Amino acid sequence: KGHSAAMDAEKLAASSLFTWDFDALDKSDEDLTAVCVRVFQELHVIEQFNIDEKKLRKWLQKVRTQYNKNPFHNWRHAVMVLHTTYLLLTSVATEFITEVELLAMLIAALSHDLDHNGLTNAFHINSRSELALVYNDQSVLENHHSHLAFEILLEKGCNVVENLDEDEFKRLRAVIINCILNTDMATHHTKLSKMEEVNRLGGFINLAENNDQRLFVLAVLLHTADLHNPIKPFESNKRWSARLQKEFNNQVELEAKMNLPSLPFMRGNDEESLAKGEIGFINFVVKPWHQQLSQAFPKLDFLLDTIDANLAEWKAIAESYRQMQENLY
């Protein structure tokens, strides 16, 4: 029965947990567990919902065991999205997000890629996979992730939301479903267009009262945290991007063995292809997204300087390879 969640951003930002340079690749298994628990603890959701910390840790374990050992879409990617969501909500959402929606964003971020196998939605649709048949080609993977999120959560020993009442769980369920389904890259352009129209009209007006407009912002922020590669230091940008390229190469190899069409961008398997793909992805997807995001939330415009520094680095790598490839001609 509160107006907004119990958060003071400046106390939260003073913690050693608050660092935009966080990279799960440099953390051990026990370190990642501590990060997830610390996010829940420092955001006060454990005490606000009387969360059994034995169920929280059991739920965390069950979440990790349902992620697969993929190069990119793995348990460390989930923790990266959880931690980045914690950074984004602390920066801009402290005064309109509710307590239940805050708990929902933490669960959704950690659960958003459950049981990923390093294959894209196009593979499932083209191969007519069992998952594609279940979901009738509609956001196949994201529907699968959200389903397993609740199958794991509603289990008795992992029920971290056991103390929520009917109305609170209904809102938590709606927030998790909408935010995970909006991690589908096929819905990126629609959210970008709506953000542009909102920015044309001056911006968001009283988010604490407009429930549907507040949910849109939460979906926008989780999608932002999902694309964490270009907003991290370049060493983090390069290691994760090289891991995604490995998944792309494995899919093309599987698609050829199954006589399925492949997209030409996924075929590149060297450093020059990596840099060229990152330049295009940043110039046409990430940068226009954060330009609209920084206009609605100017506190986040420092991310544009991180995106530009990484973009300048990838262009230096591409220029070196092109300078070596032009001499053949």
Next chain:
Amino acid sequence: KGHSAAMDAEKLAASSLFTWDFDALDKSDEDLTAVCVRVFQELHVIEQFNIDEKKLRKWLQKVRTQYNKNPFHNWRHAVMVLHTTYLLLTSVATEFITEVELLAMLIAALSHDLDHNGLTNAFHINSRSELALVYNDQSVLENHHSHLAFEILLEKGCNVVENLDEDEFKRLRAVIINCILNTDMATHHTKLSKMEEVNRLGGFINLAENNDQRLFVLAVLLHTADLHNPIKPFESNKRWSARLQKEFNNQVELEAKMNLPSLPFMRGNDEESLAKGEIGFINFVVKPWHQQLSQAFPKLDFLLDTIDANLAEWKAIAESYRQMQENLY
């Protein structure tokens, strides 16, 4: 006094001997003898060097009696490496290998693991064995194999190279020594790095004239044939891998009785440990090796599809055991 060995790959590939599905475990003792003789006969080395077939058969017998009844490193493993070497040379080497080097590759492949006792080089060095003292910790087993190869060969009734002149035997001896010594797994990474640099420069250029570069390729090919497990049908992959695991388990048992350190990968003695070890060995050793090999010799890239099929099979086995082990937690 020839430019290259007298071989036409397409005539050779039409023989019933040419089959990548060959497995020595399914052959009788007399069948294996016939396979070894047929390799020598069909490659024309018997007539090219006027080989006394009574000495060839006596040499074959003496080779077999110097192999021990190990689960993996036995006489059938030697025939597997001989036959796989015959497949590899027929596929890619017909136009640069010389007649003497061809005969040397057949002898080296059959002799490459002589008097193996199912124990690794690390055991000899750690136990300060007599063999480790003889060879000053340098490629202990491989030096031992090559020594016995010539002790068996230079015997009068087994001298299959009696008709070679001085220059031809000197090259044959150099090829056998270098190729057997390069079966030392401790030299795998160095050969992989050189193959990567050669592939960066466009590939091998006129191997028929560069003697040292041609010897490197022969060493690369014999090492390829030594690791025949992942490039065979899965039933062959599993039976031989289970035999190697038995040797690993026997060594750890011997090392504990002698108060010697043991590597943790050798302790696994069940099917789940077998699958986990094969996935790691294929992902980090075999697959990167054949990716470089297929880039220098694209005719061999079908082996990558065999490696992937076996890798997918081992991952299905590991997933079943993990799905049964995660429910305890």
